[PDB]
Point group: D2
Chain length 198, copies 4
């Protein structure tokens, strides 16, 4: 049974970068719905699987990927942010960024571009390519999860669905991108990165 | 050269169903952006086409469909709404609705379902299948335009991108859908339908 | 579990419309591989579901849809053909074909077009739309199954993957489509169609 | 106006790795049809563009990408092969492969996996990522061209559509992949790679 995880901070902890109304709706409504729907879908898949009903398993894929992915994505997203975040990472993660993108600032331009480049709903990601052994930027549509659809280990995700920023920045997604850099929990991203050094 | 058409009414003409801030942003920003992006992309295609640069033509497709589609969809959308709208259509359109969907209410349930069913950004459409000579409902992702991607002639469209309802209804897309029926310009939908019968 | 069904005829029973080597490979190798891969994938999904591993479920979707779809599609296809086939259906099925497509010949022109119109691998289908209560022609990419991805009930399928015809007709898919009508099992298609009106 | 490029060798020049029947059909029929379809589509697109018909432009995208990509892909493919090729590439290309994939053998395994991994019709590619300045392996569906859809510069392509191997290898695609390494034109692959060093 999946559950809506608790945020590591209060709804207004990311102000003024991401306002309180967005955090509350995003978490209590959007993420919550993904969780509730995911549980129903999984139960239905178990029933279809037990019956060897292939058509039913196939028909359930859209809801499983969408809500299952949404659960994966938002859960990671909350840990990627912090009221004590911002600045730049340090140590091995910082060195990997320089090595793979030239500089931290160049990395920001790249992740920003991937995030701004999404037409429609989606996510921008900084990931780790296990076979190439280096960092890699990628964009995902709707709620398609990074690992489940590309194989890359997610380290940092940026939600660019309109509900992630509209109330505060309206149509100007770029302003939202410039703002979010102020609340990134580089400690969490670093931990996720080191988990790859397994 | 494509141009941003003026709305058929003022920004606040659709209150309280779709508020003034939504109408103004939707038209002055989202649609406005599609129009220029479309014109720039077409001029770019003209140059690639002239040079027989196939890679260039292919790389421009996402922008052309997204903004070209954005222009087509929103242009139809404004005409589909009216401060004097609402109610039910009459004549041949209504009879086709009864014939193809059973009743006006059943049709409403079906278009609402298709619209509510869009995962991510998209549109819900009531269209006309010229091949079969009857009505047909369909959903399109992002800005993919109905006729250009399915062959169906657009009669009535419902924008379900979060920017079309979020500032007012937040995450409750179903409440937006319920509200929009109050401003449907059935005169315009009937016109588009009869034109398929020219 | 799932197992490879036996053909309702010998591998060379559809000559000279579809030669023996194609029937043999298509059934004993292609469909066979789909079954074996399906069983393995279902087992993997059962494990991922039990552990609540959503990423694993997502990652397995491509293999599940492709091989599960492959098993579904080929199983129907074998029953849709017969050495004692060809001609035209009768009774209610023919009645619906005339009503929904104008005539049997127009129907053939339409399904033929949808089949030849597949760019890449896929299938052409004559299905039944339960909601609208009438026939509907649709095309599906790769092994995506008709009902699982469109909701339409499959009645007659035309495999347009190159392995369904290349050994005999090479690149000329139209020649293959022209020939297959000589072996369509209208008894089976009528049976499927009657099962829908229940 | 686009034209079918002559092969750099005779149809039976790649025996016994890729027989003469496949080479003749692949070039004179498959590639040839893409060229014709491309010219016809480009012309129709020019007509639509001139009249500002956005719907017409969108409707033509599938045929343009499919046949334009087809022309791009096969044109590169022909130059990627040679009766005097095979073995390992000489010069910097090999050092780059060692750097980015560990060794030549590892490189072959990955490109083979990416090629065998295509479900349905498609291509396997060894490309060059200009932004990251290193080699990168990717797979593309149907005829979607590498540079046009991913931005990666094509260096070596492996056609895995069934028409590229079925007449000779039937369903055993892995045997086709094994055999193709014997005719790789590393001179051309290096030529394409050096053009990326700029
Ligand atoms: Mn979100
Ligand atoms: Mn909109
Ligand atoms: Mn098949
Ligand atoms: Mn080919």
């Amino acid at each position: 049974k999946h559950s809506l995880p608790d945020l590591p901070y209060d709804y207004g902890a990311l102000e003024p970068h991401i306002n309180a109304q967005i955090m509350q709706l995003h978490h209590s409504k959007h993420h919550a719905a993904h969780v509730n729907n995911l549980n129903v879908t999984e139960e239905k898949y178990q029933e279809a699987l037990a019956k060897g009903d292939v058509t039913a398993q196939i028909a359930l894929q859209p809801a499983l990927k969408f809500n299952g992915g949404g659960h994966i994505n938002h859960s990671i997203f909350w840990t990627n942010l912090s009221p004590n975040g911002g600045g730049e990472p340090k140590g091995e993660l910082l060195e990997a960024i320089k090595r793979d993108f030239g500089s931290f600032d160049k990395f920001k331009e790249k992740l920003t571009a991937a995030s701004v480049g999404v037409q429609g709903s989606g996510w921008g990601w900084l990931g780790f390519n296990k076979e190439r052994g280096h960092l890699q930027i990628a964009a995902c549509p709707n709620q398609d999860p990074l690992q489940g659809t590309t194989g890359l280990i997610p380290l940092l995700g940026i939600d660019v669905w309109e509900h992630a920023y509209y109330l505060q920045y309206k149509n100007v997604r770029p302003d939202y991108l410039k703002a979010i850099w102020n609340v990134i929990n580089w400690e969490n991203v670093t931990e996720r990165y080191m988990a790859c050094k397994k």
